[PDB]
């Protein structure tokens, strides 16, 4: 008889949602760790990029 009934809409009042979406995902990956690609990708982009 007594519970919260209705569809829940997850939302953060203070602004954390826009706070996370205005941080670039490359920076978050960088903070999780250094990004690592292949040696020939490094060589190709060192020469011709």
């Amino acid at each position: 008889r007594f519970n919260l009934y209705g569809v829940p809409t997850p939302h953060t009042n203070d602004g954390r949602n826009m706070a996370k979406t205005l941080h670039w995902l490359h920076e978050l990956q960088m903070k999780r760790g250094a990004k690592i690609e292949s040696k020939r990708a490094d060589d190709f982009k060192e020469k011709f990029q």
Partner: protein, 50 residues
């Protein structure tokens, strides 16, 4: 004792600068050798527009 405390502050700052210089040198050298061994292994770091 007042000028002794000032002197401890100055010694703190001096060791701060010399420690920061040594730590910067060590981090640069570590980064260089990490990149060298990764190139030996077959991978490499990603630098923005490298």
């Amino acid at each position: 004792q007042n000028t002794v405390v000032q002197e401890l502050a100055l010694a703190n700052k001096q060791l701060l600068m010399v420690r920061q210089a040594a730590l910067h040198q060590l981090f640069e050298k570590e980064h260089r050798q990490y990149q060298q061994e990764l190139n030996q292994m077959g991978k490499a770091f990603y630098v923005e527009r490298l």
